[PDB]
Ligand SMILES: CC(C)CCC[C@@H](C)[C@H]1CC[C@H]2[C@@H]3CC=C4C[C@@H](OC(=O)CCC(=O)O)CC[C@]4(C)[C@H]3CC[C@]12C
Ligand SMILES: CC(C)CCC[C@@H](C)[C@H]1CC[C@H]2[C@@H]3CC=C4C[C@@H](OC(=O)CCC(=O)O)CC[C@]4(C)[C@H]3CC[C@]12C
Ligand SMILES: [Ca+2]
Ligand SMILES: [Zn+2]
């Protein structure tokens with residue numbers, strides 16, 4: 001990142017990268033809030049079935065965090081919710097909560113992408129890149 | 144949500160959240176319609192092969208619902224369609240219907256995202272957030288928290 | 296807009312008519328003054 | 333001789349012509365519509381100055397007759 | 399040639415007179431009106447426009463004054479309407495001094511009372527009127543937002559009618575709705591377009607901002623009830639909203655801001671704007687700074703602190719909430735009591751209570 | 766470009782009326798797939814001056830001034846000419862944009878004429894043609910969408926839609942779901 005702004009091809013790209021990161025930090029905070037919500041909920045739900053599940057997904061805090069986080073990229077299977085016993089009510093509530101979590105994740109992701117697209121449409125890329133590259137240059141003028 | 148609008152950083156975000164939820168409710172209704180369509184179709188198709196499939200995906204109504212819903216997030220395998228017997232026609236129709244379902248899901252999702260982007264481009268975020276935060280403020284102007292307000 | 300400018304054009308036109316008629320009045324009065332001479 | 337449909341179409345089309353001329357009056361003025369008024373002013377100036385010169389020369393001949 | 403005729407093609411003299419009237423040739427029109435004796439002043443342009451309409455449409459005030467003195471001149475009501483539409487204040491004044499308006503009560507009587515008599519007063523041609531038959535001079539002036547013309551007509555006693563309720567059962571509304579039901583709704587929209595204009599709102603009523611808020615809610619409901627003309631009622635309601643916003647925008651000291659926000663400090667107008675969703679009014683910097691000064695009542699320095707310091711005081715309230723409630727019960731009136739009754743401290747107390755609730759929910763799942 | 770065609774292009778209403786009084790009329794170009802000797806010689810001679818001349822004559826015909834002042838029923842003429850130019854746009858693709866713009870001119874001329882109605886008689890005269898909604902059928906057939914979607918045509922169609930359901934016109938959607946279920 002200290003070297004790319006000098007390139008006229010890659011400067012504006014990196015400037016837009018800094019911009020979109022600064023923007024999506026806020027939606028990351030909100031997603032942290034909702035994710036913590038669902039994590040604590042499902043953890044309190046399933047914590048008692050340590051040795052009564054298919055896997056150990058939602059048994060502890062850290063493992064619930066791992067499962068729910070990896071569910072963001074679809075890398076978590078849906079068999080983690082199933083129970084070994086015949087407590088149909090608990091596993092149905094698990095299905096419902098996990099599905100609602102995924103749907104809310106999709107909703108938040110869409111809103112972030114689009115609040116961003118709106119911030120973009122109302123806007124200087126040349127000016128911003130040249131300001132950054134001029135800072136880069138001036139850093140080397142002093143002997 | 145009762146607390147975030149007070150923050151100048153997080154207020155406009157939550158306002159846009161309420162907006163996009165109110166919008167996509169309609170596409171959720173339409174997706175419910177098409178999803179129910181495909182669910183009933185595949186259920187009527189596969190219901191007779193209770194013990195002749197790889198898994199029990201499309202044998203009953205509730206399990207068909209589960210399989211088709213989890214197919215939205217790609218969390219459902221494609222081996223659920225395969226049969227144990229040599230009824231090639233039924234499993235081919237299953238392949239076709241499941242693929243068409245996924246394609247129609249993608250089509251509906253794209254249209255929703257973009258009807259939304261269009262609603263956005265023709266538009267006040269400051270004004271909306273300040274209206275909401277002013278409501279939040281005015282809620283407290285009239286002369287203890289609920290937990291401690293039990294004591295008279 | 297175009298109408299607000301057509302209004303000023305009509306202003307100019309009516310002013311022109313009035314001024315030319317005034318000059319003609321002056322000329323005819325000088326003619327009758329010559330006749331009296 | 334005219335039937336009610338013809339009368340109503342006549343009314344509506346006269347209304348349309350008047351409304352369309354009004355909407356044409358709502359267009360922004362362009363440079364040519366202003367050059368036209370400038371030429372108006374110029375020709376008016378020429379005519380008025382020539383009228384004043386006519387008055388002066390007539391007074392001169394009246395002095396000569398005196 | 400053209401398969402429609404809107405005006406035999408008069409006479410050479412009549413064509414010359416129409417040319418002189420349209421292009422403002424005052425000496426020629428005066429000469430003709432004085433000594434023609436064959437010409438009739440009601441000769442007609444190719445568009446169905448007599449000399450008075452031509453003179454008014456081109457803003458020839460002297461030609462208009464010359465024509466108005468000619469007895470039995472026609473198309474005077476439409477001349478007034480056209481001059482009002484174009485905003486020619488002086489021509490409007492000249493037309494209003496004519497016996498047709500001075501003696502009669504044309505401006506005071508309602509559009510329906512004018513319409514009951516045929517009388518063809520505002521008709522400009524053989525059949526019809528230039529604007530809608532219900533559009534009276536005052537309604538037209540309000541539409542065009544001619545402030546001086548609206549004031550003039552108000553001085554003469556003209557007022558806009560305030561259409562009846564939508565679900566109305568009286569004989570007049572019943573007969574209007576059974577007769578046409580499209581001229582009726584269009585007439586309602588015209589009267590509301592007149593009422594919702596900033597000129598009429600400002601010049602007509604005692605409290606224009608209260609009237610504008612109430613009328614904005616009225617038109618917002620009309621938009622839902624009558625969906626085919628939803629856009630028109632929506633635009634009129636927006637007109638009212640931004641009229642209120644523009645009136646608030648002009649305040650220059652706290653007394654005027656109070657008069658605008660508190661109504662005649664119970665923020666009655668702010669409550670009304672939030673209730674009717676006049677969002678630009680509430681979100682305006684003046685109303686915003688008023689609400690903000692009320693928000694930090696006794697927290698003088700806290701108004702300017704960074705967000706980190708306010709997070710600090712949030713945490714401190716979360717910690718001392720038991721002691722704070724105990725002290726509120728013990729010492730109800732003190733420095734502590736005055737600080738505890740401020741709205742921002744009430745809100746932070748609520749937030750801290752809820753955070754303690756979430757912390758209890760979590761810590762209950764400990765071990 | 767004759768005087769009448771130029772006046773129609775510029776939409777000089779008074780000049781168009783003057784020229785019409787003198788007997789000037791726009792020519793109504795022949796069919797595209799025409800075999801007569803005049804069209805054959807014009808097409809063999811240049812074939813670019815020919816198409817440009819056709820576009821000029823249609824630009825004159827499709828103007829609101831000439832449409833309003835020239836014919837007996839300008840809205841019927843405008844609908845038919847709009848469909849004509851819409852087909853011309855498909856046939857002659859190199860000048861697709863020009864014919865498309867002219868067809869749009871005709872469409873919004875019809876829309877503007879409908880926009881001026883002030884009572885039900887005029888709305889009927891515009892929509893029913895000379896109550897069989899002939900002009901509404903023609904607008905839907907030729908895809909004059911702003912004409913059909915205009916509030917006047919909309920309220921006419923709506924009054925026909927709730928013929929004998931006087932109160933039902935104003936009910937909330939819940940009550941109409943109720944009556945849907947009751948019919949089921
Ligand atoms: C392909 C592998 C083996 C090496 C990849 C190296 C790149 C990851 C880095 C290391 C050296 C860097 C380059 C070193 C010098 C320059 C010149 C610099 O300035 C210019 O564009 C020329 C005009 C000017 O310097 O003002 C732009 C960045 C660039 C290409 C850097 C871009 C990023 C580079 C290519
Ligand atoms: C990091 C963990 C341990 C606690 C996370 C708590 C947050 C989820 C909640 C609880 C307390 C809340 C805060 C309590 C008080 C305020 C001040 C409030 O107002 C301001 O921005 C200062 C200016 C003003 O109040 O007018 C904005 C929301 C905020 C930060 C709240 C935002 C959401 C917070 C941080
Ligand atoms: Ca003048
Ligand atoms: Zn009534």
Ligand SMILES: [Zn+2]
Pocket residue numbers: 795796799800801803804
């Ligand atoms: Zn031919």
